[PDB]
Design a protein around this ligand. Structure first.
Ligand code: HEM
Ligand code: HEM
Ligand SMILES: Cc1cc2nc3c(=O)[nH]c(=O)nc-3n(C[C@H](O)[C@H](O)[C@H](O)COP(=O)(O)O)c2cc1C
Lengths: 152, 439, 438
């Protein structure tokens, strides 16, 4: 029963439901999942298991429940993110030109320029097209990446 | 301060006093917000939380601690919210879709079967549609509203208990002996609601729920935080809650939408042309409903002008300041007037009172907190995707299959209850004679 | 006396044989039940249709439409020759689509029942036949399957017929207790006339008319006079078709389903034919014509319980019946169709058995041995309509659902002007086959 913490950044619940859906399929895959907002584990990234990070973007900025996390992530880097084996899923809309998936991307790559155990490559959802396709692709690939990594 | 149309009265006042004004009762202070900037501030969840208005507290007598009539800090709000949220996603709508079409087909067929000299009662037929739709998709139960003059006994009791709860709000003297029959009728309606829904839940647990609907998810769902599922009683209160949160809100949307279309015939023509291009099979598929882009714009623009749950309440979690100018004490009430927000000229332009679907052609063009027909934050409407899926589907089918006539030149009259409706809106439908599934 | 007079007269036939007499001051009636005598009573040069008291009471709102007219009345022969083409097998093609339209509403209501629920058979079948005559007849939708309380026309029609029938058993008709019945009676006639009189005028002013019974009546001409029926008679004929076909047809369908669930291997055989033949989402006219065993099932239900169980005749002159029973001019004969249909020297020794196979070779059946639709020029003008409706609907029923006699219903036959399996209920289990109109 490995520890799967799922954090979300959400203003209108798309990312939050996706997060809770993941935690629901984890339970089915024997994990010990935990769901919470992003900027509530700001600094408290799990040094064991893995942490799925599901977040939206708002005009290039983090959702209201994710701002503390990212800021902590941006400037603060001292309290390194070593040990933290994560993965990032992006909720975005192509209708937002130059800012497409900017927050998930920021978090993903920033987390790595601080000591990443990126076990599964980021995943993106375009609300303007086939968000469940991509969410589905990233998910199946995802479980396996973490599967092989640890246990089965 | 009496009137049967408070929100409308309050918009008028907002036009005089601006973005904020306050009414005071012996022990109550209420501030009403109308501007995007103040409402934006009030929707900061770390500063403000959902308040239960008196109306909501009256409905709690039968809706219990379901999501709609619960305080955020309640155990069962947290549990239910955590467990149901994924079942209300846009993707989840793909498996509700077939049963939505089922009831949509019944609506279309009813209008096809009308004789030439009769007409359509719009909010009445949209309500039958939405009540049956929520029952079938939600817990595989058919109220068969289109097969009766008198609604299913559950529906009769729900509509009556909600009307009773609204009425209590204007009762000068609740304990007058004339309210005695009301009080016992109220308990009877509660008992018919509880009994039917309880029985359905029990039959399903026994049945082993070989379905995949909301009731399935609620019986099988596990709250991660506490590890426990919802109990049978709360589950019943959630089912009662979906019908009451969702029947006249969605009802009203489709009715205001049709109102603006027949008042704006060139807009109608443009939506009808898109419904005709996109809906090419006897019955709509999920993918085709998602292609009804202009229909969608029509629906957002009717929700801009007359959002059918037009106000929501908030309380200050701690003493604070608003707009850097207005001191609030812990527990002070803020009421958001959504139709006013939707008319903020600094956001929408000067033409706010005009029906113009084209406003929503560019989503990135609309700032955050400018448009909130479904409320705010974790307490926003969990049914938002269900309702917009149902309305886009049904409005698309209506426009594909009929031409409409404002045969009485209807004068808009907005009745206020928990919701808004174009009271007495009637039309005449003329069939284009296109079969829905075949001849 | 009895609430079930025909079943009672059948028992007496069982004991006294092919003819027996009842006498009142003035009225003598003989009751005929053998093919041998009924065959003679069916000679129209010797015997003509008599109007029983029931029909006289129905005549107060059906007027001189075809069913409650004397053969000698002007409006009878005129209407008979004008409407005859509208009821032929050929004309059935043109009614089929609207027939299917109401049959789909029936099947969709049953598809949409919750699993704990049940079907009220004669009730639903009456809803269906009423709406079918309305739509096929004069393009009018009662929308019975959209209601708890029937359309005001139907409420009044049903109430007026009930009062007509009840008037028959009334010992003290002018008791003050019947004053409201009388007023309601006049109220119901006005309802019926006012609705039908309006539909007629609207169509007359209509400049894009159809091809239904109403247009055939508006354009039909009396050969001699060169004129059509006047609008009052047309109104009487419309009321007449609803009256004469609504419960007769629904009863047929009801008894037929009764006998099928009680005879499960006959159900299966009928259902195997519906599946083989009804291969399109909506039935076609040809396909209905291919339902031969469903056609035989119906004929066998008509044989055991013909839903218009009796017809009355009068001697047009002094004559002898069967060479040994003398009749005076004007003497009424009553034909007990269910007894006739059990004539053992015709049908053999298993006359209470439900055996659709009897109708395998119709040429086998002697003239005047099977008469559920009456006799000669006064036979049922709506026989084709009725049989096309029932075959189509029973076929679709057997295609889309399995039936369970969940209450193990005990047959209880209610007698009014018609017969019906009172309180017959069932449960339908969808075969989950979609159709037309979904
Ligand atoms: C077009 C129609 C609808 C509109 C405009 C609408 C609007 C809203 C709004 C404004 C709120 C927040 C109320 C508050 O803050 O006090 C809300 C809450 C709610 N809505 Fe809706 N709603 C719609 C349809 C639906 C439907 C169809 C359902 C059910 C399937 C639904 C379920 C609820 C529930 C359960 C809540 C409470 C959520 C929570 O606080 O956890 N609504 N709705
Ligand atoms: C299974 C169904 C039906 C049965 C068993 C049936 C049987 C009868 C019987 C036995 C007669 C003779 C009446 C007598 O001698 O007094 C008759 C006549 C009549 N029936 Fe039917 N009927 C059926 C349904 C229909 C329907 C569907 C219509 C109408 C659309 C119809 C219209 C009439 C009319 C108008 C007459 C009088 C014909 C005349 O005397 O010119 N019947 N029917
Ligand atoms: C005002 C606004 C701004 C947005 N800005 C962006 C953005 O910068 N980048 C992006 O990829 N998507 C953008 N989106 C699309 C949202 O991220 C998409 O709807 C997300 O699925 C919403 O997730 P949520 O409900 O959890 O808050 C924006 C949406 C809104 C309403």
């Amino acid at each position: 029963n490995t520890p799967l913490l799922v954090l979300y950044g959400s203003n209108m619940g798309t990312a939050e439901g996706t997060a809770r859906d993941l935690a629901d399929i984890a339970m089915s895959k024997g994990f010990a999942p935990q769901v919470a907002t992003l900027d509530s584990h700001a600094g408290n990234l799990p040094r064991e298991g893995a942490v799925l990070i599901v977040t939206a973007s708002y005009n290039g900025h983090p959702p209201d429940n994710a701002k503390q996390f990212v800021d902590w992530l941006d400037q603060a880097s001292a309290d390194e993110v070593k040990g933290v084996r994560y993965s990032v899923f992006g909720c975005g809309d192509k209708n937002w030109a130059t800012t497409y998936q900017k927050v998930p991307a920021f978090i993903d790559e920033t987390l790595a320029a601080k000591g990443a155990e990126n076990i599964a490559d980021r995943g993106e959802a375009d609300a303007s097209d086939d968000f469940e396709g991509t969410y589905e692709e990233w998910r199946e690939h995802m479980w396996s990446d973490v599967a092989a990594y640890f246990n089965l | 301060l009496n009137t049967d149309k408070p929100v409308q009265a309050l918009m008028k006042i907002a036009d005089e006093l601006g973005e904020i004004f306050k009414f005071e009762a012996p022990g109550r202070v209420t501030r009403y917000l109308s501007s995007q900037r103040l409402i934006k501030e009030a929707c900061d969840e770390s500063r403000f939380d959902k308040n239960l208005s008196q109306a909501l507290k009256f409905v709690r007598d039968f809706a219990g601690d379901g999501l709609f009539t619960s305080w955020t800090h309640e155990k069962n709000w947290k549990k239910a919210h955590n467990i149901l949220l994924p079942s209300f996603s846009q993707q989840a709508m793909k498996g509700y879709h077939a049963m939505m079409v089922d009831i949509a087909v019944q609506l279309v067929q009813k209008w096809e079967r009308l004789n030439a000299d009769e007409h359509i009662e719009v909010p009445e037929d949209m309500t039958r549609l939405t009540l049956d739709t929520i029952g079938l998709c939600g817990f595989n139960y058919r109220f068969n509203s289109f097969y009766r003059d008198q609604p299913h006994p559950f529906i009769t009791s729900m509509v009556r208990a909600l009307d009773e709860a609204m009425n209590k709000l204007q009762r000068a003297n609740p304990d007058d002996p004339a309210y005695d029959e009301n009080k016992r009728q109220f308990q009877e309606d509660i008992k018919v609601m509880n009994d039917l829904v309880d029985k359905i839940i029990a039959d399903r647990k026994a049945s082993g729920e070989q379905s995949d609907d909301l009731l399935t998810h609620m019986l099988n769902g596990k709250d991660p935080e506490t590890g426990e599922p919802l109990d049978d009683e709360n589950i019943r209160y959630q089912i009662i809650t979906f019908l009451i949160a969702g029947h006249e809100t969605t009802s009203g949307l489709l009715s205001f939408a049709l109102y603006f279309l027949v008042k704006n015939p060139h807009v109608l023509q443009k939506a009808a042309e898109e419904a005709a291009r996109v809906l090419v099979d006897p019955v709509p598929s999920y993918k085709q409903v998602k292609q009804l882009k202009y229909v969608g714009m029509v629906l957002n623009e009717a929700l801009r002008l007359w959002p059918t749950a037009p106000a929501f309440s908030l309380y200050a979690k701690e003493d604070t300041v608003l707009g850097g100018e207005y001191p609030l004490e812990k527990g002070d009430e803020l009421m958001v007037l959504i139709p006013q927000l939707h008319r903020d000229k600094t956001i929408w332009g000067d033409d706010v009172e005009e029906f113009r679907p084209e406003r929503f052609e560019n989503p990135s063009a609309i700032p955050q907190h400018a448009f909130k027909p479904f409320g705010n934050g974790q307490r926003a409407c969990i049914g938002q995707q269900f309702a917009l899926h149902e309305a886009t589907l049904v409005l698309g089918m209506m426009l594909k299959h009929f031409d409409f006539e404002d045969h009485t030149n209807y004068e808009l009259d907005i009745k206020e209850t928990l919701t808004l409706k174009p009271e007495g809106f009637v039309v005449k439908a003329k069939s284009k004679k296109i079969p829905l599934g075949g001849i």
